[PDB]
C-alpha cells in the first residue's frame, strides 16, 4: 500500500557459488546456485546480503516483471555486516527505476514489511511483522529482530516501515533486519576506501578496575574510572604508544567506566568497543590514559585487526605449499572448521586451540604454518600419520609464514631438509630426492602445482 | 570349586572434596568383589577401597561381615592387598591359585557379584589381545589383558580363571568402553606378582618405574641415514626427557634407543614378546622395580653408548592422583589457592574435563613437563566473596605465576611468600595477563571472618602449617 | 507509558548465596550467584523476593543505567511471604530517585505490567498481562496470578496497574504477584518489632460442630455456631486460658460458623485462621467460647507458632553435637528434605513422620534429637548403621534438646555413657575412651569442632 | 520322567471384601500348578487356593478335571495339601520324590504351567542363596531357597527338581522382585516336611512357633563389657518381648541370649548352618513345632540362666492375614467399625499401603505390639451417610480409643458397650483428638434403614452375634 512505490526497486538475485576446499586448498568445490533478493539505491547500486554472493562466480539480477537476467558486478562484500554491494554495467537495467528511500530507526513493535522473491518464483512477496527486539549482537553491531517470515529467497530484500521508507536489509519463525546505521557505515566505509575494510579496533585486552586496592595501588583517585591494559597487539599502531598497565580513562572524550562501559541511552550502557566500531579505518581518536600515576593523552590512528588465525580470508583462495607430499598450509578459522567441523573449538588439537584463543601475531606477516597432511609415497614412508602439526623451524631457522617456508625449501642446498615440528618431532628428507619426488605426487592427486599462486 | 574364595567387599569411603578442599564428602558405602589367595590375603581393586575408613568382607554363604585390614594400595595397577584377623573368615576356604600368562583367544571366566547383589555372578569370554594400558587415566601404563567379556562394578575385583581353574588375574572395568561394548580388562599375574613381591620386600608399595622419555619412530630411511644409523640398526629417537628424571643427566634428546636390557627395540618402539607377538618396549621397563637399574644402549652422534640407569617413578606436573592424601589449599582474603591435579579437574569440570576445562590448563595436562621436583600448577580456585575482594569475585581456576615479582613454583612457595610479605601490597600475577592487588595488612585481617562464614576450619591444609 | 516514571526505581539484584548443608551441618556449600530484580520504596528501602537473597553472603544493587553495583544490607527476610527488605548505606545510591507509588487492589482481568531485568542483562524489561486469579494459597495469604512471563531475573521487580501504580512484587507460562496487603503486613510487622516475626496463630486444633447430637450434648443452642477445640499447643499462650472441648464462637466479635469459616465478601467465606493471620504478633484478641455450657470471653495476646520440627530455621545455621563419631542433630523440615529428598513426607522413617505430622512441642525448648549418623571408627564398632534415630535418654535422664544432651555428655562422670535410642536400642560407650576418640574423628572428616557455636 | 505328576490346579475363590466386610466378591477361577506326591496327596501353594469354594485338578494329557479335597492350608509356609477321591486321577502316575536340602549353586528345574496355558513349562536355574524370609508379608519368617530362575503365577506351586530328579521343594513367586529380575524362591523340603508331619500328627495345621522377642546385636566391645560378658561369650540383647508371648514371663529386656537348644548364637544373631555357611538363629526356632519347648540360655545381671520355654505362634496386633475367616465388623447409625489387618490396609490403600496409609496406622503396623491376647486396632472404617450422622460423613479409617470413658480393647468389646449402653449419649473418642457423639436411642433406631439402603444383611459379622 505504502510500500508499492518501491516494489519496482526490489530485484531477484541469482548467484552461482564456487567455494574453495580449505582441507584440499588446490580444489574448488562443485558449483551450486542460490536465489536471494536485493534492491536498488541511489548511484547505480544494489544492496543484498553478503551470504547471497559469498564465493560468487556469477551474479545475475532480474528486475520486477522483467524478462531479462542481467549480469551484475560485485563492488564490495562486508563479511562482518552481511552486506554486499552490487552494480550492473548495462544502462537499460537502470533506465527509469526509482530507487529505495531510507527511513528513521524504528522503535519496537513498529509495523515492518519485508519485500522480496520466494525461492523458485519471479513474483514479489510481501511479509508483515513487528520489531521484536533490538540488539547489539554478533564485531558486534545493531540488528533488529522481527516476528515474521524471511522466505530464504526473501533474504537480501528491503524492510519497510509503516510509511514508505526502508528500514534495512532482511536476512534469514523469526527473522532479522540489518539496520540502517550498519548499512550507513558499510556504504561510507566503501566510499572512503574504494573497498570494504571493516570496523576498526583498539587492539588491546583489558581488565576491570573495580577493586579499591588495585585502583589505589596504581594511583587512581576515587573519581577516576577506566580499564587496565593487559596486552597490546604487536601489529597494532597502539603498540607503539600505549603500554601494558596503562589505565584507559576515555576515548574521544567519552568517559569509560571501571567495567569498560560507556553511556548509551537513558538507563542503558554498552561496551566502549562499540564506540570504536562506529569509527572508520584511518580515523584518529584521542585515548586518555593513566600511566605511572600521570595522565597522558594520545592521538591514535585506527586500524583493522590482524588475527594470527584469521577469522576469514576475504574470499581469497587458501594458500598451500607441497614438497615430497608434505602439504603445508596456514591455520585459519575456515581451515579449522573444514578440518574439525562445527565444534572445532572443542575438537581441534589443543595446541592449535591455544593459539586460536590466546596467541597474538608478533609481526604483520606471521602465520601459523602446519603440516596439514602427508600424501603417502615412498619418499615419505614413516611420516604418513602427521596431521595438522605446527612447523616451527627449517634447517635451524624459524618459520615465520608459509611464503617464508617455501623460499627456504626452494633455496635449500644442504644434503638434508630438517623440519622441526610441534611435540618435539623432526622430519628429515634427502633434499635431492625429496624435490624429485614432488611432481609424481602432484600428478597422483591431480594437484595443478606445488604451491598456490600467491607464493 | 573355587567360588567360596570369592568375597564381597564392603567399603566405607570418606572422600576429599577437591573443589572444596577443606571438606570431606558424606560417608558412603560401596560394594565390589575380591578373592582369597594364599597367606591369609585378599585381593581387590585399589579403586574399590580408595579413601577407606572401614573395609568389611562377606563370603557368599554366610550373613557375617568380617572387619578387614588394608595392607597395601597399588593405585597404578589398581590392586589392593587386604587381610582379616578373625579366623572364622579363613577357615575352610581353598585359596585361589594363579596360572601362567594366557595366550590370545584362551577362555577366561570372571567370578564376582552384581551391583547391589550378594549372589555369585559368572561372566565368560576370551582373551582378545595383550595391551599396555593405563589403569588410572594419565598414569603409568602396564601390561593388561583385554577380554571379550563385560566387567561392571560389583565384579571388577573378582578373579578371572583359565579353563584349568587357575587365576590369570583380577577383573577390571574398562574406563574407555561403554558397558554394552562387551569389552573389559584383566590385571594379569605378572603385574599382581610385581605388586605382591614389591610389598613383601619393602613393607610398602613402591610403584612402577618409567624411563621418563618421549620418543619418535625411526621408520623413515632418510631420518635413519642422517643420524648415522647402520642398516642393521633400529630403535626410536628421544624427543624430550623429563627434567625431574635422573636419566635426564645421561640421556639426551635425539639419542636413538637401540636396546633395553639387551632386548632389541624396533623402529616402531616394539620388542619381541612371544611367538608371533610383539609389544611396546615399555613393558620391559614397567616389569622392573623402582630403584632397579637398566642397561640402555643408544646411538649418539653416530656412536654407540651404553648407560646403566637407575629407574624412578614418574612425576607428572598435573598428577593423575595424589595417593589418597588430602588436596592442599591455602586461603588469604577469601582467595582460595590450590593445585591442579586430574581429580581436581574431574571435580571441577566433570567426566569430560579433557574437552570442557580451560585450554590453558588442558595444555599443561597434556603437554607440560615438570621443570623441577616440587613444581606444581597453582591456581586461584575461586574467591570467597567479601568486601576485601570486591571486583575479583569471578576469578575461577586461573594459574598464579608470580607474587610481588617472584615466580610461583608451588603452593608452599606461594604460602610462604604471602606469610612473609612485608610490602604494602600483595600483587599476584595471574594467567591471561591479569593482576590481583590487595593491601597486605587488611587482606590478612579479612581472612578469619571469611573462614568463619564458610565454616572453614583452617586457612590452609595441614601439609602447609 | 504510564509505568515509565517509576522505571528508574527498579533495580537489579545480584546475590551470592552460601547454603548450609543440613545433612553435614558443619559444612557450607559452594557459593553460587543469582540475579533478580527489586525496587525502591519510601524511606531508603528496597523490596525484593525472599528467595532472591536466601542465604545471602553478598547482595549488590545496580540502579537503571548505572555503572555501579552498590553493596546492600538485608534488613529483614519474611520467609512465609517471600519478601525481603534491603537498604544501601551509601547516600549516592539514593540521590535523586523517585520511589515507587502503590495502588489499589486490582480486580481480575485488569491490565498489569511487570518491570525488571532479564538474566544476564542490565536493561529493563517490561512484560504485560492480566490478573488470572486471586487466591488465598500457600500461613495462607493473598496472591495474584497473572498470564504473563516472569523471566526469573524479573522476579523481585514491581507489578504495575494500568495507571502508574504498584500492585505488588512479581515472583517466578504463568506468574504470580505478591499483593500489597501482604507487603503491607510485612512492612508494618518489621516496623512494629524492628525485625520480621511473621503472622500469628491461634495454636489450637479444632473439630467442626455440625452434628445436632454433638451440639446438643455440649449445650449449644440452635443459633450458636463454632468449632470445638481438639488440642492446644503447650507452648502457646492460649494453653493457659483455653481448654480442650471449648467451643470457639467468635474472634474479635467476628462470628465463626460450624465449619470454621467467617464471612469474607458477598458470596464468599474463608477460614477463621485467615482473620488471625492479619493480626500482628503481640496484638490482643477477644476469643469467645462455650465451656461447660457457659459463655466465656478471653483477651489473648497473640504469638508466633513454635513447631517441634521447625519448618525452617530462619537462616540460622543447623546445630550439631559429636562425641566418639556419633553425630547428633535436631529434626527440622530442611533436615528431613536434605536427608530424604522432595518426597520426605513419604520416604522418611515413620517414627519421624508421626512426630512431624502430629506431635506438639511440650516445652518451648523441646527439640527432636536424633543420631544423624555414626562416623565409623574403632571406638564405635558395631554401631555404624544407626541412621536418623531418636535419642530419648542419656544415663537414665530424658533428653529434652540438643544443648541438654551435650551438657549431660560433657558433665558425665560415670564409667559408661548409655544412650536410649528409639526402637528400644541402647548405645553404650566407655566414657573416657569415647571422649578421647572424638578429636581424631573430627580431623578425619574435617569438622572444625565437636559442636556448633550455639551450644 | 516325573512330569505326569505335575497337575494344573483350578480354584474357584469367593473372597471377602475387606473394605465392605458384609460382601463377598464375585466368584472367579484361577489356575496354578501343583504336583502329586506319595500317599494320594497333592501339594500346591496356599495362595493358589485361598477362599476356595471348589478345587479341581487336571493332568497334562487328559481333558478331565477332577474334584479335589483341601486337607490343610499352611498360610505361613504357603503350602496347601490336597487329595482326590476319583481314583482315575491317581492311576498310572509315579509320585514325586523328595531330595536333600540343596547346596549353593546347585542346579534346579521348576516344572509347571504358564498363566492361562495347559501345556507344561520348564524353567531352569541355580540355587543362589539360603534365606530366612516371610512367604506372607508381615508373617513368620521361614527357611527358603533363592533361585536364579523366574517364577510367575501359573508355575508357583509346581515342583522344583535337583539334577538327580528329586524334588527340593515348591516354586514360589517372589513378592519383592519384579518378574524381569529372574529371581524366585523355593519352599524347601524341611519346611514341607514340617507342614506334612504337623498335619499328620495333629489332624490340622498348627503353624510355626516364634520366640516373641526383638533383639539388638552385641558387636560393640564396650556394650559387651558393660553387661558383664566374658570375652568368649557372644549373643544378642533382647530389646523388647511380646506381652502376649508366654516367654514374657521368664525372659527380660536386656537379657543376652547366648545359645538356643545348645547352639551357640553369635553377636550378629547368626548360628552355624553347614560347612562355610551361617544363618539367622530363628531357623532353629521355626523348625520346631508349636508347643515344643526350647532351652534358652541368657546372661542376666552378669549371671547365666537357663530357661525351657514352651513356644507359641506369633500374635500380631495388625495381623498378616486372618486365616480365611470373614473380616469382623459392626454397624450402628451408619458408622462401620472394623479392625485393622494387613488385608484391610491392602484393600483400602492398594499394594503400596506401606507408603500411602495414614501414618498413625502405619506406626502400629510396623512398631506396635499387642498388649493383650485379644487386643485389636478398631477403626471407624467409613460412615454410611444418613440424617442421623450429619456432620460425620467424612470420617475414614480413624482408630476408636474409648467409648463413654472406657478404653476400647477390641471389636467385640466395643460392640458390647454399644449394645449395653444406657446413657443418653454414645460418645466415641477417636484418634486425632476427635469425638463422635450420638443420641443412644435414635442412633440405634436409625441403623435398620441404613442397612436396608446398602443391602447389608446384618448389623454385625456372625462372630459378634
Swiss-Prot record, chains B, D:
What are the inducing conditions?
A: Induced by trans-zeatin (at protein level).
Q: Name one GO cellular component term.
A: nucleus
Residues of the region (Serine protease) are 19-196
Question: Tell me, what is one Gene Ontology molecular-function annotation carried by this entry?
Answer: serine-type endopeptidase activity
Q: Which residues form the PDZ domain?
A: 212-292
Top-level EC class: hydrolase
Location in the cell reads: Nucleus
Enzyme Commission code(s) on record:
3.4.21.-
Q: Hydrolase as a keyword? A: yes
Q: In which tissues is it expressed?
A: Expressed in roots, cotyledons, rosette leaves, cauline leaves, stems, flowers and siliques.
Instruction: Please describe the quaternary structure of this protein.
Output: Homooctamer formed by 4 homodimers. Interacts with ARR4.
Q: What family does this chain come from, according to its entry?
A: Belongs to the peptidase S1C family.
What is this protein's function?
Serine protease that degrades the two-component response regulator ARR4. Regulates ARR4 stability by targeting ARR4 in the nucleus for degradation. Acts upstream of ARR4 and regulates the activity of ARR4 in cytokinin and light-signaling pathways. ARR4 mediates the cross-talk between light and cytokinin signaling through modulation of the activity of phytochrome B.
Protein name (record): Protease Do-like 9
This protein's species is Arabidopsis thaliana
Note the residue range shown relative to the complete protein.
123 to 587 of 592
